[PDB]
């Protein structure tokens, strides 16, 4: 939703635009059960992310300052090569390999150390 096909720089505005609770909305025994289960799971996903952000020291931040320097093995490129060229979809596909590493580093540097 929104300008997914735009550079990450352009998408810095898209980023905050789409940060709506798109995980919640207003609609108005089997069908009822299936949808109730879906709603509960959407809530858990929302909270899971909010909790993770709190763990990393991010609260109410759409752009959250870290305490971890970027590690160049993680597809370095350049800043203009990503912010003014690659889209977020493309970028994440290249960074997917380091997701676990990154998260562990974010927690330890920003809050535990």
């Amino acid at each position: 939703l929104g300008a997914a096909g735009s550079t990450m720089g352009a998408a810095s505005m898209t980023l905050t635009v789409q940060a709506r609770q798109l995980l919640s909305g207003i609609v108005q025994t089997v069908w009822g059960i299936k949808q109730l289960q879906a709603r509960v799971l959407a809530v858990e996903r929302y909270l899971r992310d909010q909790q993770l952000l709190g763990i990393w020291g991010c609260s109410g931040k759409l752009i959250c300052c870290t305490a971890v320097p970027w590690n160049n093995s993680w597809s370095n490129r350049s800043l203009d090569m990503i912010w003014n060229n690659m889209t977020w979809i493309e970028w994440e596909r290249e960074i997917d390999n380091y997701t676990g590493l990154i998260y562990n580093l974010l927690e330890e540097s920003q809050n535990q150390q």
């Binding site: 939703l1 929104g2 300008a3 997914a4 998408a11 810095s12 898209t14 980023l15 905050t16 635009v17 789409q18 940060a19 709506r20 609609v27 069908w31 299936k34 949808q35 289960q37 879906a38 992310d49 952000l53 990393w56 991010c58 931040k61 759409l62 752009i63 959250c64 300052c65 870290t66 971890v68 320097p69 970027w70 590690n71 977020w88 979809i89 994440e92 990154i102 580093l105 974010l106």
Partner: peptide
């Protein structure tokens, strides 16, 4: 520096239940 961005306009294929 590894800045965290929230509300990133990306997706992954997934299966859920439509109404």
């Amino acid at each position: 520096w590894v800045t965290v961005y929230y509300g990133v306009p990306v997706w992954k294929e997934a299966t859920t239940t439509l109404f």
